[PDB]
Design a protein around this ligand. Structure first.
Ligand SMILES: Nc1ncnc2c1ncn2[C@@H]1O[C@H](COP(=O)(O)OP(=O)(O)NP(=O)(O)O)[C@@H](O)[C@H]1O
Ligand SMILES: Nc1ncnc2c1ncn2[C@@H]1O[C@H](COP(=O)(O)OP(=O)(O)NP(=O)(O)O)[C@@H](O)[C@H]1O
Lengths: 168, 195, 73, 176, 163, 62, 681
């Protein structure tokens, strides 16, 4: 009976986890638009994986192997975006909700991120983001301005705007 | 007082940093491409004057030292020269130099080539105006928000420290235990006197 | 400040017909995408500055604007 | 399907009823600071379900518009989306709050949490997992977690958390 | 003597805080109230855009508002008794152009006492600066040197490519 | 270093070189304790330090 | 320790000062220079000891004693020449760098006096040659560490370069003096053009008369001198023209005539042509505007295609020379590695169980030289920062010059890893050199090739696993978890390696993983229980693991009690079931019974190694207390009988499966042995 239940947990956990691992490696390789990046998602104690840590080591685009804490936030967020996108690509999910991910990213990195978002957005999932840098919602096709109003308390309202009658 | 300039050798990604054109007094903004290594500058500037950063375990301390190519350094060192023209810092010079040699088993502060005792310097910076343990007035990338959602007691401690009322508090509570022990001793004394 | 300079630009763009009705569709008929979005967000910050009141009924249509209190005249 | 549009009422600085417009394939929600835009996401996390502690407000009673200031407006709230999938039908989910409790609606009929949940589980979203929402500052804290929490998430998505009690009960018995 | 110092310093910081926060935000007011006592905590009561109805608590705010509170406090506590030097890392992410212009004007006026180093990705913060710097990272080592204002103001926004 | 209260400095910072001959009759407590209260431009930090010094001195005598 | 080091070095200093002409002086110098980089205090003391023992101003009198010291230094270097020069060079860095200030400059005068006096000794030598080449080699090292010391005499060194003999040591003279010239020529204050002319002339004369490595190491110097001072690149252009034309004529003649006789006649020309085109394209890029003098025809693609053609042929040496050429071509343009043909070629040659044994060695040598050259170029290009830095953008952040070295590795690593499991030894030695030289620059992710890098510690040759294990401890000391993650696969791969090749081999890892209590319990419980109870693990594997377990040093008391406890429990249940099923009722029985009996005997041998009563063991229970069993286990000397016992029981097994009636009788005897084991107290 113990063997039965261990087979259950092991079978499910390992199937999902290995699929995620291979897919995160390919996804990150694709995401940096370079070819020298790695990301390894490895379990500990591989005889009973379901009860131990599952560690995560990623390499920067152009530097040495360092512990995850040492790496800067700008790479950190790209790693997190990759991991998220992988997790979704295992078992589909109808939408994202991205909220000011461009906290520390430079304009160039957000532009590359936008190119990925745009090529992926068509036939796989709907994605709604809140951001400030216009370089992230420029690839978008319809904008949603949201404005407050002074009063006894701040009462807010919404209004839309189309963007598919414009050049490049 | 007025940070004139800094010199770095082998810390994190500054292998050998010779002299740079000195700072100004008013406003010197640094900009740079994503991943260049500008926060590590401030990590150096705070690794010297603030004790808290160098409290991690040896594994991280070894990680701290730069390891790019060629040989492997073992003794990194950072020097700072600033001017206490207002004599806020007491020992009179025009360009004070302080360096912190870092090694796996070595940790030294050279103040004008004369040895120190790692405590006089802490009391020096505290008496000068610095606060060796306070994260305040050094703001890392991302932890500004936490100053607002912090519980009130944290801000009370922060402002109370701003008032400059920490050393007095600590020394008084430490002294109370010793004095009470002397009270017991005096009791013993009276006993023996009667005998 | 480029913004308040553009605000004077808004004043002069309004002062030409005097029908107190700036349409959005017309104002964006012949521009590129990025600057159009910039101008739209500028409409938003203008609504922040209380110098203008805007109206929109349908989900997708032009916005109709009129000067409010702090127009600075 | 996809996420067509939503509906707000009195929830977190949105007085009255107004209809968020139809969503295109890939939209964005822009606006200047302090305008109150995060709270639409809060609404989304409240229709699809999220524990109240994650909703950046204590006690669930300051949810009603104007309560944290000091004066409420009514004793209701009403947030609701309209999921549109293939087949030319349209579903209307809802969730209204009363007193402390919260009641869920499917097709404008009061339901209990469990069946509503099971419908979502058919659709493909594990609310307890919390693997597809990212608040203001958590994009960093996705990486720097202690590995256990990440294992917890991976165990949650994989339907292998229900089989826990079975496991350790068997464990105790066999070791005995 | 300690108790007396506590009293006076609380008064001074409270007043200066009210001043700075009223100046930064175009309309509003905020103050620092003590709690029940001995003392146990310091709370803050802030209000804007209604000016009488608003009386806030902490958990329901925005990034910009919270960051403004903190930066205002930093500027205030400086205006009481200046500190050696300030270095800001990624402070500017939350605020808008209006707020950023305001903070830059406060920096420009407040500059004449202490030293300021800071980083950013936005142009506005270098509306008020004497001399800049730069940071180049080649061959797996990092260097730092001075540059001129023109290339900086160009680099900050005008280009959106991979170089 | 230099001054008529340097012993209390030493007892408040280093305290180890302080011998039984120093502690014994160098300082008349009741005068320096009076001295602490009205001295011009006394830092509170230094005041606490000097407190620790004189109390430790008293402890040693006891 | 750090005490003992200081004391022994003090003793050594007094030895080498007081009674010289002792035989073992040289070795003492070798060991002390070996320890220069270990620590800080030791570093300071060795630096001051070497500053007072040799590098002292040595005033210009009693020159014979000075010469005797010179003899001492030459002897030291000539004996340590076998192993390496890294420690000596590091020491020289330390002594020179350590006085950058004015500080009376005590060493600069003395060192220059040592080199000029060696020059003078060389002069009066006139005609033991081992000492000659050793002195020239010492000159070479002293030039490498700093070039200013040997500026004046190079023109006087020129006559030796002109002509020499066909012996080894002489060849060493030629390469080293070429190396010196390479190092010194650009800094030479205002040279004479005819001197350069005769240099280049005899360099070509040397090329056309000697072996491979010397040609390489001199055309290097040729490239250096042409790229620093002169401009007559038409010469090298014409040389490459002749060779290029030659190889094209051979290729064309061979393309339709695979049976011609010209190959058996012109073999030397063909071999030399391959080597020369490789070295020439490597060191000095003539694919530019003026070399051709017209529009480029992508000659690099040409030579690549011609060599790639000549790869498929009937001899072997031709293939070796062609792949060496390909590597040299690679050393200038890394992007060429990306081509599909070279990629697929390498990944076919290294795998598929190929006949050749020289190709693999050559491949690993290619990777090693690529890695070293790239590292050194990057470093010495960092050295001269300020002169060229200011004219590169801040918005670019180049990557194709930096990231490449990682990506390339990603195409071969795994295969290279597989190439660890080869029966020859030289291939293993170079493979381990390649991977452990790779990893120290962080190019690749460590934990996917950790188990293999641990299991390679159970080879016979000592230097191999010495380097391996040292590298592993360096991998471990930073990152706590890594080794603990992959441990059972480690020993499994180790066992596969041993069964491919044919005490306490695994002891080093076992000692390393003893720090964490839970990890310690974990790996042991997992491996021991999984293998024995229900898995049909190889009997040889069981023997390997059993011997390793018995050999393991134990420094606490938790381990024997824990292992004994769990073995007992499983033994009890399994064995009981087994015996009742056999009595109630079969080669399957024979196998599983062999398993269980070996584990039994392990328990018994352990119990004999401690000589503890079963009562005390059974008294122990898991997680009783941290501090109760803190006694170090005493070990009786020379009781290591586990090997012998296992050979006895292996003979009882007899390595015979399902052949004869007699084994069935042995099976019955084995069941009787189980009954006896039950009987035993
Ligand atoms: N000791 C070290 N040796 C080499 N590289 C290092 C070392 N420490 C950090 N780095 C690298 O230095 C780079 C810059 O780090 P850091 O200074 O944190 O960037 P940052 O300026 O904070 N990035 P950002 O906030 O997005 O602008 C990172 O890619 C690190 O991996
Ligand atoms: N129920 C409520 N009724 C009215 N106002 C509220 C309510 N709850 C919160 N607020 C206030 O309204 C604003 C909404 O905050 P929040 O939704 O976090 O804004 P935000 O979208 O994060 N702002 P920003 O990122 O700067 O664009 C804040 O000023 C709150 O204090």
């Amino acid at each position: 009976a113990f063997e039965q239940i261990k087979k259950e947990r092991f079978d499910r956990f390992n199937a999902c986890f290995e699929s995620v691992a291979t897919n995160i490696d390919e996804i990150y390789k694709a995401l940096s638009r370079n070819s020298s990046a790695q990301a390894f998602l490895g379990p500990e104690n591989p005889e009973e994986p379901y009860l131990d840590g599952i560690n995560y080591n990623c390499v920067a685009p152009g530097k040495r192997f360092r512990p995850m804490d040492n790496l800067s936030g700008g790479e950190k967020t790209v790693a997190a975006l990759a991991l998220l996108f992988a997790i979704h690509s295992y078992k589909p999910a109808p939408f994202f909700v991205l909220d000011q991910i461009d906290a520390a990213l430079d304009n160039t990195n957000i532009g590359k991120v936008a190119n990925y978002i745009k090529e992926q957005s068509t036939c796989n999932f709907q994605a709604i983001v809140i951001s400030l840098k216009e370089e992230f919602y420029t690839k978008a096709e319809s904008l949603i301005g949201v404005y407050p109003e002074q009063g006894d308390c701040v009462i807010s309202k919404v209004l839309t705007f189309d963007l598919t009658k414009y050049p490049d | 007082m007025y940070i004139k300039q800094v010199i770095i050798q082998g810390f994190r990604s500054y292998r050998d940093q010779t002299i740079v054109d000195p700072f100004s007094s008013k406003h010197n903004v640094i900009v740079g491409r994503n991943g260049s290594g500008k926060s590590n500058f401030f990590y150096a500037i705070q690794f010297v004057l603030s004790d808290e950063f160098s409290h991690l375990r040896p594994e991280q301390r070894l990680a701290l030292l730069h390891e790019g190519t060629g040989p492997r350094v073992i003794s990194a060192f950072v020097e700072i020269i600033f001017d206490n023209s207002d004599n806020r810092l007491p020992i009179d010079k025009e360009e004070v130099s302080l360096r912190r040699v870092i090694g796996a088993k070595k940790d030294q502060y050279f103040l004008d080539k004369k040895m120190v005792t790692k405590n006089d310097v802490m009391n020096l910076l505290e008496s000068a105006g610095f606060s060796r343990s306070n994260p305040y007035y050094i703001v890392k990338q991302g932890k500004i928000n936490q100053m607002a959602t912090a519980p009130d007691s944290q801000r009370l401690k922060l402002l109370r420290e701003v008032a400059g009322t920490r050393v007095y508090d600590e020394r008084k509570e430490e002294s109370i235990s010793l004095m009470k022990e002397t009270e017991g001793k005096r009791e013993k004394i009276n006993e023996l006197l009667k005998y | 400040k480029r913004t308040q300079q553009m605000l004077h630009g808004l004043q002069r763009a309004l002062a030409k017909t005097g029908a107190e009705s700036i349409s959005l569709l017309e104002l964006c008929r012949n521009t590129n995408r990025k600057q159009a979005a910039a101008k739209f967000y500028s409409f938003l910050v203008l609504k922040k500055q209380q110098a203008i009141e805007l109206t929109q009924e349908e989900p997708y249509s032009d916005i109709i604007a009129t000067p409010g209190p702090r127009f600075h005249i | 399907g996809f996420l067509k549009l939503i509906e707000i009422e009195n929830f977190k600085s949105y007085k009255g009823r107004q209809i968020i417009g139809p969503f295109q394939r890939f939209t964005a929600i822009i606006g200047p600071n302090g305008s109150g835009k995060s709270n639409l996401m809060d609404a989304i996390s409240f229709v699809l379900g999220e524990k109240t502690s994650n909703l950046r407000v204590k006690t669930l009673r300051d949810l009603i518009h104007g309560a944290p200031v000091g004066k409420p407006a009514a004793n209701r709230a009403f947030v609701s989306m309209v999921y549109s999938e293939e087949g030319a039908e349209d579903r209307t989910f809802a969730r209204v709050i009363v007193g402390g409790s919260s009641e869920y609606k499917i097709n404008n009929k009061v339901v209990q949490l469990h069946e509503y949940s099971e419908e979502l589980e058919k659709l493909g979203i594990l609310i307890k997992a919390r693997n597809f929402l990212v608040f203001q500052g958590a994009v960093e804290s996705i990486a720097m977690k202690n590995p256990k929490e990440r294992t917890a998430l991976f165990e949650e998505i994989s339907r292998s958390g229900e089989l826990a009690q079975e496991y350790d009960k068997r464990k105790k018995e066999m070791v005995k | 003597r300690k108790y007396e110092a506590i009293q006076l310093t609380f008064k001074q910081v409270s007043k200066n805080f009210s001043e700075v926060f009223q100046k930064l935000v175009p309309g509003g007011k905020a103050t620092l109230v003590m709690k029940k006592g001995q003392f146990t905590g310091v709370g803050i009561r802030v209000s804007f855009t209604g000016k009488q109805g608003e009386m806030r608590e902490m958990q329901q705010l925005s990034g910009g508002q919270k960051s403004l509170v903190a930066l205002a406090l930093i500027f205030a506590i400086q205006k009481c008794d200046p500190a050696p030097f300030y270095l800001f890392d990624q402070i500017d992410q939350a605020l808008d152009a209006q707020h950023r212009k305001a903070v830059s004007d406060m920096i420009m006026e407040l500059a004449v006492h202490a030293q300021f180093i800071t980083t950013t990705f936005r142009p506005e913060l270098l509306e008020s600066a004497d001399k800049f710097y730069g940071v180049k990272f080649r061959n797996k080592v990092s260097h730092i040197d001075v540059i001129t204002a023109e290339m900086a103001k160009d680099f900050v926004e005008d280009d959106t490519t991979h170089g | 270093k230099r001054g008529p209260l340097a012993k209390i400095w030493l007892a408040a910072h280093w305290d180890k070189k302080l011998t039984k001959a120093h502690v014994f009759e160098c300082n008349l407590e009741s005068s320096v304790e009076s001295i602490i209260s009205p001295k011009v431009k006394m830092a509170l930090r230094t005041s606490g330090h000097l407190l620790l010094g004189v109390v430790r001195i008293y402890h040693r005598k006891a | 320790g750090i005490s003992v080091r200081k004391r022994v070095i003090k003793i050594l200093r007094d030895i080498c000062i007081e009674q010289p002409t002792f035989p073992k002086i040289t070795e003492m110098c070798v060991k002390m220079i070996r320890r220069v980089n270990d620590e800080e205090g030791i570093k300071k003391l060795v630096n001051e000891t070497f500053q007072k023992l040799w590098f002292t101003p040595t005033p210009h009198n009693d020159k014979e004693a000075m010469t005797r010291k010179i003899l001492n230094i030459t002897d030291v270097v000539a004996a340590c020449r076998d192993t390496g020069y890294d420690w000596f060079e590091q020491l020289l860095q330390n002594l020179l760098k350590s006085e950058e200030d004015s500080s009376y400059k005590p060493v600069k005068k003395a060192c220059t006096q040592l080199v000029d006096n060696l020059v003078e000794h060389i002069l009066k030598y006139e005609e033991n040659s081992g000492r000659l080449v050793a002195c020239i080699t010492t000159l070479f090292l002293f030039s490498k560490i700093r070039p200013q010391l040997m500026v004046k005499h190079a023109m006087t060194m020129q006559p030796y370069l002109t002509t020499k003999c066909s012996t080894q040591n002489d060849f060493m003279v030629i390469c080293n003096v070429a190396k010196i010239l390479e190092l010194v020529v650009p800094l030479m204050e205002h040279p004479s053009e005819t001197f350069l002319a005769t240099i280049e002339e005899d360099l070509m004369k040397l090329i056309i008369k000697y072996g491979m490595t010397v040609v390489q190491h001199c055309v290097s110097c040729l490239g250096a001198v042409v790229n620093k001072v002169t401009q007559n690149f038409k010469f090298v252009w014409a040389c490459f023209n002749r060779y290029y034309g030659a190889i094209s004529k051979l290729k064309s003649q061979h393309q339709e005539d695979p049976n011609n006789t010209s190959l058996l006649t012109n073999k030397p020309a063909l071999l030399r042509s391959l080597f020369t085109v490789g070295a020439l394209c490597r060191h000095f890029d003539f694919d530019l505007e003026d070399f051709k003098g017209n529009s480029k025809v992508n000659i690099k693609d040409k030579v690549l295609e011609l060599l790639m053609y000549f790869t498929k042929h009937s001899d072997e040496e031709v293939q070796t020379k062609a792949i060496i050429g390909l590597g040299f071509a690679f050393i200038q343009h890394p992007s060429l590695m990306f081509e599909q043909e070279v990629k697929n070629l390498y990944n076919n040659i290294l795998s598929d169980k190929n006949s050749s044994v020289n190709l693999k060695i050559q491949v690993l040598k290619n990777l090693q030289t690529y890695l070293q050259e790239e590292d050194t170029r990057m470093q010495q290009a960092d050295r001269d920062w300020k002169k060229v830095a200011k004219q590169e953008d801040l918005k670019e952040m180049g990557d194709v010059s930096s990231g490449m070295s990682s990506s390339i590795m990603q195409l071969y690593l795994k295969q290279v890893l597989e190439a660890f499991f080869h029966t020859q030894s030289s291939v293993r030695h170079f493979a381990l050199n390649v991977i452990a030289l790779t990893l120290n620059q962080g190019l690749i992710h460590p934990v996917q090739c950790v188990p293999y890098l641990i299991a390679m510690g159970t080879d016979p040759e000592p230097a191999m696993r010495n380097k391996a294990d040292q590298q592993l401890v360096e991998i471990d000391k930073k990152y706590a978890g890594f080794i603990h993650m992959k441990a059972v696969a480690g020993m499994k791969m180790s066992y596969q390696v041993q069964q491919a090749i044919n005490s306490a081999l695994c002891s080093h890892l076992y000692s390393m993983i003893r720090g964490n209590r839970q990890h310690r319990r974990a790996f042991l419980i997992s491996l021991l229980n999984l293998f024995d109870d229900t898995a049909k693990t190889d009997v040889t594997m069981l023997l390997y693991i059993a011997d390793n377990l018995a050999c393991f040093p134990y420094q606490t008391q938790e381990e024997p009690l824990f292992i004994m406890h769990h073995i007992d429990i499983t033994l009890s249940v399994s064995g009981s079931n087994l015996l009742q099923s056999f009595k109630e009722s079969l080669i399957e029985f024979a196998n599983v019974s062999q398993g269980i009996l070996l584990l039994l005997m392990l328990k018994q041998h352990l119990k004999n190694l401690c000589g503890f009563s079963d009562s005390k063991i059974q008294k122990y229970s898991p997680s009783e207390s941290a501090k109760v069993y803190d006694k170090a286990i005493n070990r009786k000397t020379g009781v290591h009988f586990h090997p012998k016992q296992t050979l006895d029981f292996l003979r009882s097994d007899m390595a015979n499966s399902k052949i004869t009636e007699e084994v069935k009788r042995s099976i019955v005897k084995q069941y009787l042995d189980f009954k006896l084991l039950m009987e035993h107290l």
